[model samples]
Target: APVKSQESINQKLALVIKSGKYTLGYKSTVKSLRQGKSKLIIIAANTPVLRKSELEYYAMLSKTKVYYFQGGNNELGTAVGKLFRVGVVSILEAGDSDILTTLA
Candidate 1:
């Protein structure tokens, strides 16, 4: 089953981020994806079009969802409350409830 609620996903993702099991950061996520280290890629809104396309292609080929936050760039930035060129991305290696079930 896929992750259903954004809250759940966020919760699980937050846990992952806090665990230090994996590196946390936008660039790291992208690099992991490019290097085939990530099994799933979660992209933030407001990601650059060029980079989004490139990452999306890899996600598709890798059979990943390329999950997007509802808010685009601005929304993503505000949510994370940061100002940066690239949006947030998570390179996930394990399954969690947040990512296992998606919102309807």
Candidate 2:
């Protein structure tokens, strides 16, 4: 069940990426979050503590939703079709994708 769920999440992420509704990396995500441009923030399991804390603080203040990706940074990067690790991501729009359900 968990495996299937991860696969489904990956598919949804791919769709989001294709639609170009996401911002990758911590800096970009933080900026988006602070500006109230992000609808949701996704953090990889292996993300650094400092970055994660900062993101959480900003998210809390902005009332943005946060999702902790169960996988490590590299896996999360691959899921989003990136060549490098992705420690954080901010979704500006969902673009008809049901990716947010995975967080629930």
Candidate 3:
């Protein structure tokens, strides 16, 4: 499947977060990536270089594909926190095979 567009991915991301099922904050998400538990990772364009490097390192180590969503920190943060002006959000792999649709 083709990778989702920024808009489509953003909408699905929002739903994932709001559903309170498989959403995770930055720290936990990083760990998930490191543990090879993340099927897919999405990083915001405005993610700080330092944080992005950490995520990239883990994703690379775990062989996970990280997608760059063309959005700012505020947008990404809002999706995670369900509020404004935050930085990053991660969708955790909670053993759900269907959720892969959003990543693709």
Candidate 4:
């Protein structure tokens, strides 16, 4: 259960990172959402509840899709192959990836 979708998501995430534009962290996510430039947004399951709601409402105004990563910040960072923890990500451009069509 949830196995295929999880793996596929990570695969698409890699392509996005390699070819598209995105921003990481809570502050960055909010800023991008308010600017109305974010196409899609994802936040770790472990992101603080209050902060999570903050992004949700902002995304609502920006008409952006937001999803909850199946894992926490550490896992998100690892998925992106980054050394820092990533609690949120704002995908500004999908580039060659079909991630723009993926919504949870």
Q: Which candidate gets the maximum TM-score versus the true structure?
A: 4
Q: Which ten residues in a row have the lowest lDDT in candidate 3?
A: 93-102
Clashing pairs in 2: none
Per-residue CA lDDT of model 1 for 49-99, tens digit only, reads 887888787666554566676354323333233555334555455443344
lDDT scores for all predictions? 0.53, 0.68, 0.58, 0.72
Residue pair clashes in candidate 3: none
Give the top-scoring candidate (lDDT): 4
Q: Candidate 3, overall lDDT?
A: 0.58
What lDDT score goes with residue 57 in model 2? 88
Model 4 Cα displacement at 92 (Å)?
Answer: 1.3
TM-score to native of every candidate shown: 0.57, 0.73, 0.60, 0.79
TM-score of 3: 0.60
Stretches of candidate 1 off by over 4 Å are 1-5, 23-26, 61-63, 72-87, 95-104
Model 2 error, position 28 (Å): 0.8
- The per-residue C-alpha lDDT of model 4 at residue 74 equals 38
lDDT value, candidate 1, whole model? 0.53
After superposition, candidate 4 runs with Cα above 4 Å error:
1-7, 79-81
